[PDB]
From a paper:
To investigate the relationship between mutation, disease manifestation and fibril morphology, we have determined the cryo-electron microscopy (cryo-EM) structures of several ATTR amyloid fibrils, which were isolated from the amyloidotic tissue of patients with hereditary ATTR amyloidosis. Based on cryo-EM, however, we find essentially the same fibril structure in all patients, demonstrating that the mutations do not necessarily lead to different fibril morphologies. Each molecular layer consists of two discrete density regions that correspond to two ordered segments of the fibril protein: an N-terminal segment, extending from P11 to K35, and a C-terminal segment that spans from G57 to T123 of TTR protein.
He underwent cardiac surgery one year later, due to acute heart failure, but no additional symptoms were noticed. For the three fibrils we obtained spatial resolutions of 3.18 Å (V20I) 2.37 Å (G47E) and 2.99 Å (V122I), based on the 0.143 Fourier shell correlation (FSC) criterion. Yet, they exist in different chemical environments: while residue 20 is part of the N-terminal fibril protein segment and located at a buried and hydrophobic position, residue 122 is located in the C-terminal fibril protein segment and affects a solvent-exposed position. All three fibril samples contain both mutant and WT TTR protein. A superposition of the three structures shows that the fibril protein folds are virtually identical. The backbone root-mean-square deviation of all 92 resolved backbone Cα atoms was analyzed with Chimera25 and found to range from 0.5 Å to 0.7 Å for the three structures.
Residue numbers in the entry:
A (entry chain C), B (entry chain B), C (entry chain A), D (entry chain D), E (entry chain E), F (entry chain F): 11 to 35, 57 to 123
The structure:
């Protein structure tokens, strides 16, 4: 007998991010995968991935140049941080 | 007997993001995959992915230039952060 | 016997994003995939994906230039953050 | 008999990020993998990954240049830090 | 009989990040792996990973240059640090 | 009989990061691995990893240059340090 009881008595006004998970039992392969329960990506860049089988196999000349140079201002007050009876703010 | 009881007694006015999941049992392959329960992507860039089988196999000349240079201001007060009886704000 | 009871007693005025999921049992392939329960994408760019089988196989000259340079102001007060009895605002 | 009781008596207004997980039993391969319970990535860049089988197998000349040089100001007040009866703020 | 009771009596307004996990029983391979309970990555860069089988097998000339030189100011007040009745702030 | 009771009597407003884990029983391989309970990485860079089987097997000339030279100011007030009734701040 598998019993799971979570947040049974929520009183007043709490801030909660609950993620309950119960389980009873050619190039890339993923099986029985759980992902992104609470994934947060900012400025994530993948230039080349999984090009393929036999890419540039023979006589190949390749020039790769990656220049990251930008005035980007990523300003996040709260990330994955539930709050209660609080004062949160951003001032510029 | 598998019993799952979540947030049974919600009193007052809480802020909650609950994600319950119960399970009882040529190039890219994904099987039985759960993803994006709460995925948040900002400025995510993939230039080349999974080009293919035999890409640029022979006698190939390739020039790749990636120039990221932009005045972007990504301003997010709250992300994945439920709040209660709070004062949240953005001021410019 | 699989029983799942969620948010059984919602009292007052809570803010909730609940996603319950119960399961009992040539190039890209996805099987039994759950995605986008709560996916939020901002400024997500994929230049080239899955070009194909035998792309630019022989004698191919390719010039790729990616220039990201724009005055974009992405201003989001609340994202995936349910709120209650709160004051949220944006001021410019 | 497996019984799991979590956050049974939530009184007042707490801020909580709870993630309960109960389990009873050619190039890349992942099996029975749980990931991203609470993953937060900022400025994560992978230039080349999983190119493929036999890439640049013979007579290949490749020049790779990676120049990261940008005035980026990543300013995050709270990350994965739930708060209560607090005052959080950003001032410029 | 396996019984796990956590945070049974939450009184007042605590800030908690609880992660309970109970378990009863060609190149890269991962099995029964749990990861990212609370993973936070900042400025993590992998230039080349898992290139592939037989990469640059014969007669290959490769020049790799990695130049990290950028005025980036990563300013994070709180990371994975729940707080209560506190005053947290950033001032420039 | 295995019984685990944690944080049974939480009084007032504590700040806690609790992670309870109970278990009862070609190149890289990981089995039954738990990782990232609370992993925090800043400026972690891996230039080359797991290139592959037979990489640069014969007649290979490779020049590798890694130049890390950037005015980066990583300023983190609190990391993995829950606080209570405290005043934390950053001033420039």
């Amino acid at each position: 007998p598998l019993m799971v009881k979570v947040l049974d008595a929520i009183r007043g006004s709490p801030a909660i991010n609950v993620a309950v998970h119960v389980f009873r039992k050619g190039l890339t392969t993923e099986e029985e995968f759980v992902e992104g329960i609470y994934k947060v990506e900012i400025d994530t860049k993948s230039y080349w991935k999984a090009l393929g089988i036999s890419p540039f196999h023979e006589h190949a000349e390749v020039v790769f140049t990656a220049n990251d140079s930008g005035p980007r201002r990523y300003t996040i007050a709260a990330l994955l941080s539930p709050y209660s009876y609080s004062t949160t703010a951003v001032v510029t």
